[PDB]
Amino acid sequence: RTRLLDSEIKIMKSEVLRVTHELQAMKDKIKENSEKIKVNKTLPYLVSNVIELLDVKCAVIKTSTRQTYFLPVIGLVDAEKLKPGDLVGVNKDSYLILETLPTEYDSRVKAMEVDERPTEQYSDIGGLDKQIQELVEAIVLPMNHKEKFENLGIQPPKGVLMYGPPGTGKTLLARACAAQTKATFLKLAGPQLVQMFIGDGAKLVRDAFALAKEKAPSIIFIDELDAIGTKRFDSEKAGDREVQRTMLELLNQLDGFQPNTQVKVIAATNRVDILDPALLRSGRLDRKIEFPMPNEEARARIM
Amino acid sequence: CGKTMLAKAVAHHTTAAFIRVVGSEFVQKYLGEGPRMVRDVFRLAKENAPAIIFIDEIDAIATKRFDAQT
Amino acid sequence: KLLEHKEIDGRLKELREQLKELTKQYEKSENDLKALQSVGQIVGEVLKQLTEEKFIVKATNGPRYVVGCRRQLDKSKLKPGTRVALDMTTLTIMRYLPREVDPLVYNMSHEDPGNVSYSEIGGLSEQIRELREVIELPLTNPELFQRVGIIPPKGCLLYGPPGTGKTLLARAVASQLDCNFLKVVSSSIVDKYIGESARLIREMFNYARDHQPCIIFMDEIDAIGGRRFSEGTSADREIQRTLMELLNQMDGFDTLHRVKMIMATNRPDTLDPALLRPGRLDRKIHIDLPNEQARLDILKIHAGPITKHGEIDYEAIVKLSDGFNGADLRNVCTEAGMFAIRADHDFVVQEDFMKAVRKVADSKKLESKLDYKPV
Ligand SMILES: Nc1ncnc2c1ncn2[C@@H]1O[C@H](COP(=O)(O)OP(=O)(O)O)[C@@H](O)[C@H]1O
Ligand SMILES: Nc1ncnc2c1ncn2[C@@H]1O[C@H](COP(=O)(O)OP(=O)(O)O)[C@@H](O)[C@H]1O
Ligand SMILES: Nc1ncnc2c1ncn2[C@@H]1O[C@H](COP(=O)(O)OP(=O)(O)O)[C@@H](O)[C@H]1O
């Protein structure tokens, strides 16, 4: 029975190890949580957009107060978490980053979301079935069927463009898609993008063009492109720069450097002329889609 | 027609203090930086000696049709 | 009898192990705990060095201050315009740093990832070769350029009908070349903060000026492209300067070196005289609508990955296909593809082609004026 008591004596000395660390646990297990709550618990958070992530573990940041402070202790926040333009909790006193924040995104942009979600089915309509197919056929299909397109080696049309009389019925089609396309509906007015501050239109478009890229899939509806859609003259004395650039900005978004098939872009305009000729093309909006004033039966159908 | 060359030539053969300040730099993200510079370039000009202050594209500064409100 | 060593080591191994497992957590976290007291450090450029220790530094976040050095910082290194870490109470140098690049020079620098090489496109080895020589060569084969007595090219500007293959060129170039292409859509550069577009441009050329060689590729300049006035809104004044900011850098006093610039536009009719001029833009690169050859040439490139029974009507499609740009053709494929998917025929043919082609050339009537030459 010696080795029993011999391996027995070990247990308590063995137990010491675990038993003693439970002390060593609480020791830091409390001070860890303790001070962290005091410094972190500080619900005041001055968000600061990172700039340079110098690894010489250093990194500078500019505050929401527009103040640059080189913190030699990135503090709570892994490198990866690190990169420029990235919301950060910064203890007000310390400018020590507490938390990482989600990301920027315009309160003017968020209003482009869709909670109430229309309720217009299709039968609501009438006579528009030609394009209603197209309407579907350019978004729903390419969305709920991306494996079929390549199995024929193709590519899916990049969004559509609605035009025609101003009473035929197009906003319903949007309404129709909005209720149908379970995808995150992105309805936006062409006028809204029209702003004062020399940098709201581009920003908002980017903001809207990003918000969609982070909720795939998405159909962004753009009522009356004319709002932001109009050829660009070339005068001297004065001339629309914003409405142009915003278009440009927008243009540079739809296509241009870096492609994207995560977002569907559907723009109606009571007048498909004023629109500049770098919005139509075929890449920007693939499908030019007429809305002809209806016949009769369709009329009989609407009434 | 060769004005920016003319400044390069002068800063070459020159002998005084050629200050190359761009009129597009004067306006910063601050409410006084501009005058603070001009008082500097002009202050520095006095100190240096017969100095050439040169402003390439004064348009960025002086464009008459101002608009106090924006 | 021998089962005890386990019951000894069993306890031991785990016990002796789980000991450090949980002990290390305190060290790492503690570092995180300790580092807490640790503290921000003001930033600024040295305006100048009053005395060895006396410094005139304009807070990077505001006004100027008289301050001293630290000690082992190197009073010699501290120099005018040098960005330094500064103190939040002592308000002295907390440690000199280098020239940042803002959070915008990364997106156009390390970010914009080009795609396939130049082979991906074509239809006109005209600009492909023409640009390459101006742009690529004057770098790896400029050492002999002086043997002719000619400075490397300055800048190159695409300019063509919307869809001639411009934006696809910048991608092909940065993909193949690879060096330091920083793409500027010339739109997201604009902000609203007096000279917020002056700093972006400065950093762009500064970063590059130091980081050169670098390719500068500006997507749509018609923004800052501008043209000046006499005049327009108080807004236009901002752009101009900004529009000029670049112009003064591209030429002015300090002479661009290594760092080259691709100018992008659809419609060059809008641009300022002072920009097109050599010393700023060397030779303009036109990209016309693919020829019947160029079409056919491009047509077999986008429709190449399509299931097509021994009926490919390439000579027919291309034929009817006139005035059709490079995507008007792609669309043609994509269009037919919808006929392809359409009704039901996983395998396309010569039917879902023409239908598209005219269809693709039918709506093309809604595009008045698609050409605009420069000067
Ligand atoms: N096929 C249709 N069936 C029923 N209503 C229609 C139809 N086409 C148009 N409308 C009517 O038009 C209105 C929407 O007009 P809309 O065409 O969206 O204006 P705009 O084209 O200027 O946006 C709806 O109230 C709807 O009742
Ligand atoms: N007579 C000349 N001698 C030398 N260079 C000339 C002459 N005329 C024109 N140039 C060239 O044209 C360019 C003129 O640039 P510049 O007049 O500074 O343009 P900007 O007015 O836009 O600054 C210089 O590169 C210069 O080499
Ligand atoms: N020469 C070409 N070869 C292949 N594809 C082309 C060509 N030209 C245009 N495209 C199609 O259009 C796109 C290029 O459009 P882009 O040249 O950027 O128009 P823009 O000049 O208006 O920016 C490509 O993604 C491709 O699908």
Curated annotation (Swiss-Prot), chain A:
Gene Ontology terms: biological process: blastocyst development; modulation by host of viral transcription; positive regulation of proteasomal protein catabolic process; positive regulation of transcription by RNA polymerase II; proteasome-mediated ubiquitin-dependent protein catabolic process
Primary residence: cytoplasm
Molecular-function annotations in GO: ATP binding; ATP hydrolysis activity; identical protein binding; proteasome-activating activity
UniProt: ATP binding residues: G164, P165, P166, G167, T168, G169, K170, T171
Description of post-translational modifications: Sumoylated by UBE2I in response to MEKK1-mediated stimuli.
Keyword Nucleotide-binding: yes
Keyword annotations: Acetylation, ATP-binding, Cataract, Cytoplasm, Deafness, Host-virus interaction, Intellectual disability, Neuropathy, Nucleotide-binding, Nucleus, Phosphoprotein, Proteasome, Ubl conjugation
Record keyword Acetylation present: yes
GO cellular component terms given for this protein: cytosol; extracellular region; ficolin-1-rich granule lumen; membrane; nucleoplasm; nucleus; P-body; proteasome accessory complex
Subcellular location: Cytoplasm; Nucleus
Complex formation: Component of the 19S proteasome regulatory particle complex. The 26S proteasome consists of a 20S core particle (CP) and two 19S regulatory subunits (RP). The regulatory particle is made of a lid composed of 9 subunits, a base containing 6 ATPases including PSMC3 and few additional components. Interacts with PAAF1. (Microbial infection) Interacts with HIV-1 Tat.
Entry's family note: Belongs to the AAA ATPase family.
Involvement in disease: Deafness, cataract, impaired intellectual development, and polyneuropathy: An autosomal recessive disease characterized by early onset of deafness, cataract, severe developmental delay, and severely impaired intellectual development. Patients later develop polyneuropathy of the lower extremities, associated with depigmentation of the hair in that area.
Protein name, UniProt field: 26S proteasome regulatory subunit 6A
Organism of provenance: Homo sapiens
Lineage: Eukaryota, Metazoa, Chordata, Craniata, Vertebrata
Curated annotation (Swiss-Prot), chain B:
Functional summary from the UniProt entry: Component of the 26S proteasome, a multiprotein complex involved in the ATP-dependent degradation of ubiquitinated proteins. This complex plays a key role in the maintenance of protein homeostasis by removing misfolded or damaged proteins, which could impair cellular functions, and by removing proteins whose functions are no longer required. Therefore, the proteasome participates in numerous cellular processes, including cell cycle progression, apoptosis, or DNA damage repair.
Subunit composition and interactions: Component of the 19S proteasome regulatory particle complex. The 26S proteasome consists of a 20S core particle (CP) and two 19S regulatory subunits (RP). The regulatory particle is made of a lid composed of 9 subunits, a base containing 6 ATPases including PSMC4 and few additional components. Interacts with NR1I3. Interacts with PAAF1. Interacts with TRIM5. Interacts with ZFAND1.
Family stated for the protein in its record: Belongs to the AAA ATPase family.
Protein name per UniProt: 26S proteasome regulatory subunit 6B
Annotated source species: Homo sapiens (Human)
Coverage span on the entire protein: 210 to 279 of 418
Compartment(s): Cytoplasm; Nucleus
Originating gene: PSMC4
UniProtKB/Swiss-Prot annotation, chain C:
Residues with N6-acetyllysine modification: K58, K192
Residues engaged in binding ATP: G160, P161, P162, G163, T164, G165, K166, T167
Keyword Cytoplasm: yes
Localization: Cytoplasm; Nucleus
Family annotation (PANTHER family): 26S PROTEASOME REGULATORY SUBUNIT (PTHR23073)
Protein name: 26S proteasome regulatory subunit 10B
GO molecular function term, any single one: ATP binding
Pfam family, one: AAA
GO cellular component, one term: cytosol
Residues recorded with modification Phosphoserine: S230
One GO-annotated biological process of the protein: positive regulation of inclusion body assembly
Family: Belongs to the AAA ATPase family.
Subunit details: Component of the 19S proteasome regulatory particle complex. The 26S proteasome consists of a 20S core particle (CP) and two 19S regulatory subunits (RP). The regulatory particle is made of a lid composed of 9 subunits, a base containing 6 ATPases including PSMC6 and few additional components. Interacts with PAAF1.
Function text: Component of the 26S proteasome, a multiprotein complex involved in the ATP-dependent degradation of ubiquitinated proteins. This complex plays a key role in the maintenance of protein homeostasis by removing misfolded or damaged proteins, which could impair cellular functions, and by removing proteins whose functions are no longer required. Therefore, the proteasome participates in numerous cellular processes, including cell cycle progression, apoptosis, or DNA damage repair.
